[PDB]
Design a protein around this ligand. Sequence first.
Ligand SMILES: [Cl-]
Ligand SMILES: [Zn+2]
Lengths: 30, 30, 30, 21, 21, 21
Amino acid sequence: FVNQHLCXSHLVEALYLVCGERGFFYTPKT
Amino acid sequence: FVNQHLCXSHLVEALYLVCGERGFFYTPKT
Amino acid sequence: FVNQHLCXSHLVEALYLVCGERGFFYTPKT
Amino acid sequence: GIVEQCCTSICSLYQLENYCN
Amino acid sequence: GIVEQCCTSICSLYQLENYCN
Amino acid sequence: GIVEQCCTSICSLYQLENYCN
Ligand SMILES: [Cl-]
Ligand SMILES: [Zn+2]
């Protein structure tokens, strides 16, 4: 897997990929 | 809707989404 | 074609588009 | 400029809608 | 913060998996 | 480096084509 900074749309797609059928949750709160 | 800066590919997709059947126009001239 | 900086996911998609059936190779080594 | 109103600053859904047909 | 652990810093596959259901 | 010629600088369509098979 990559060793880079994943932000916004790229972070969401990364989760989508990594999580498979588990699905995931995205709640930005910076 | 998001409150972030939308650039290039992410701006184009945002328009695509927001505009629906209206379609849209993208003409960068910075 | 664009005259901008293509990075990560946007660089990969650009290659995909530009190369067609030739396919391509992506090997970052910065 | 769309790149100036939305890529440099933040565009409310409305501002963004000014670019639909 | 996911935006803080992965968008500001680097998240190993594992760290990223902490956000799956 | 592709990341150096296209992500740091600008790659004309041609330069980009140097990475197709
Ligand atoms: Cl980006
Ligand atoms: Zn991006």
